[PDB]
Design a protein around this nucleic acid. Structure first.
Ligand SMILES: [Mg+2]
Ligand SMILES: [Mg+2]
Ligand SMILES: [Mg+2]
Ligand SMILES: [Mg+2]
Ligand SMILES: [Mg+2]
Ligand SMILES: [Mg+2]
Ligand SMILES: [Mg+2]
Ligand SMILES: [Mg+2]
Ligand SMILES: [Mg+2]
Ligand SMILES: [Mg+2]
Length: 74
RNA sequence: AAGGGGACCAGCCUAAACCGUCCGGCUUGUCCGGGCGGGGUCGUGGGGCCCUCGGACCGAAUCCCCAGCCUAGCCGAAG
């Protein structure tokens, strides 16, 4: 059963990452303890969109940073 | 059972794409979701979206009116 992890998890996987595990573990451990959610399509969009936002504001930093580089140095 | 002879006869509304708006969630938006509206309904495949061109006839199974009918009756030839 595919699920997206909410936390860095011992020898299962990384925060934000999508993994495959036996149904009961998802249903009766992970999901209730809030360490993950169903890797559904509906909130696969949510993941994919935040990935976009974190990539948006980060390289946006390197943009305004590099622009202040050019002002200075000269 | 198909087929043939007949009775009767009538076909429609949605879901999804996409678009709009209200609402709440927390993981703040090109977000996910739930309402309502618009769009759409097909098998010669159909629909959405994007370009070019084209710009009144139909019509209910709903509603209203009326005939007709039902729920009392009446006229009715000639010892
Ligand atoms: Mg027959
Ligand atoms: Mg027949
Ligand atoms: Mg008959
Ligand atoms: Mg929705
Ligand atoms: Mg919406
Ligand atoms: Mg909506
Ligand atoms: Mg087509
Ligand atoms: Mg109808
Ligand atoms: Mg009499
Ligand atoms: Mg008499």
């Amino acid at each position: 059963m595919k699920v997206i992890l909410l936390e860095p998890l011992e020898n299962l996987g990384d925060v934000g990452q999508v993994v495959d595990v036996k149904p009961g573990y998802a249903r009766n451990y992970l999901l209730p303890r809030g360490l993950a959610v169903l890797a559904t399509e509906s909130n696969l969009k949510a993941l994919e969109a935040r990935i976009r936002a974190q990539a948006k504001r980060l390289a946006e930093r390197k943009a305004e940073a590099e622009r202040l580089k050019e002002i200075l140095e000269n």
